[PDB]
């Protein structure tokens, strides 16, 4: 006779797939970039 069994497993709290990590990294990178560049433009324009 066929001895078989079945069971169920629920898992949760996936931290993040790949695009979430990619998005937060590039978002912080470009935020730093635009902040430094706004400072650059402000200084170089106010010298003139």
């Amino acid at each position: 006779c066929e001895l078989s069994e079945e069971f169920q497993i629920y898992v949760d709290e996936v931290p993040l797939p790949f695009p979430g990590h990619a998005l937060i990294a590039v978002a912080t990178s470009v935020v730093l970039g635009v902040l430094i560049f706004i400072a650059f433009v402000f200084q170089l324009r106010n010298i003139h």
Binding site: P15, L16, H21, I24, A25, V26, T28, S29, L32, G33, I36, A39, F40, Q43, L44
Partner: protein, 250 residues
């Protein structure tokens, strides 16, 4: 001189002057980078503990991405001034290698594990901290002293080989498992050169013929050799240190 109207290359040199004015002379940007690196160092010290990492693993991944992207942004900004000068530098090669290994292990699958991710981060911690002045002189003179350390190390190893021939004549298959295997024998001799706790070895070859045997001879030869070599090595170390440090004092 008077410079009635600037040209294209004066404009380019001026632009590079503002580019090196920030993030290379401003203490604020370097202070922020050091603050971020000390924060991720604190999170590194918060590891070796899963009870903390269960609510922190996602945040650890995010701050890993943040420090990696600011590192590669710094490397790209350094490459902006020119690839030749960044390639031809004494120390920027190390930061480039660090970020290259870290990014290669990050984006592409790798067997690098924490044993690569964390030591590379603390190497970057060191490379940031030496730029702030009051340890730069000591690290500079350490790297100035090491080429003079090299000859002392080479002479010590050569002398230890030419005395390890005399060693291995009375070694192997008798008082074994530390005098055998000809490289484990060499490293046990090195252990005794470091001169701590060889009384286990002293009891190892003890009771050869319970009064003198070779229990006298091999022990006294190896002991006088050990004490002479240990004194010579420790001296040569401290004297090379002070010799290369006098170069600092000039």
């Amino acid at each position: 001189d008077v410079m009635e109207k600037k040209d294209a290359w004066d404009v380019q040199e001026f632009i590079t002057q503002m580019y090196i004015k920030q993030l290379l002379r401003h203490p604020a940007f370097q202070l922020l980078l050091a603050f971020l690196l000390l924060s991720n160092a604190i999170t590194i010290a918060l590891r070796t503990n899963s009870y903390l990492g269960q609510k922190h693993y996602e945040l650890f991944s995010t701050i890993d991405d943040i420090v990696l992207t600011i590192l590669i942004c710094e490397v790209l900004l350094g490459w902006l001034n020119g690839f030749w000068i960044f390639w031809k530098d004494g120390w920027n090669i190390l930061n480039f290698a660090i970020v290259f290994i870290l990014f290669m292990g990050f984006f592409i699958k790798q067997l690098d594990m924490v044993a690569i991710t964390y030591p590379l981060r603390v190497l970057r911690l060191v490379h940031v901290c030496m730029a702030v002045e009051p340890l730069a002189r000591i690290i500079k003179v350490i790297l100035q002293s090491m080429p003079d350390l090299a000859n002392v190390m080479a002479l010590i190893l050569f002398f230890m080989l030419v005395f390890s021939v005399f060693g291995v004549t009375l070694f192997g298959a008798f008082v074994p498992k530390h005098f055998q295997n000809m490289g484990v024998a060499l490293y046990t001799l090195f252990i005794c050169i470091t001169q701590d706790g060889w009384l286990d070895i002293y009891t190892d070859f003890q009771m050869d013929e319970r009064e003198y045997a070779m229990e006298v001879g091999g022990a006294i030869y190896f002991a006088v050799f050990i004490t002479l070599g240990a004194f010579i090595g420790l001296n040569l170390f401290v004297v090379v240190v002070t010799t290369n440090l006098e170069q600092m004092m000039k």
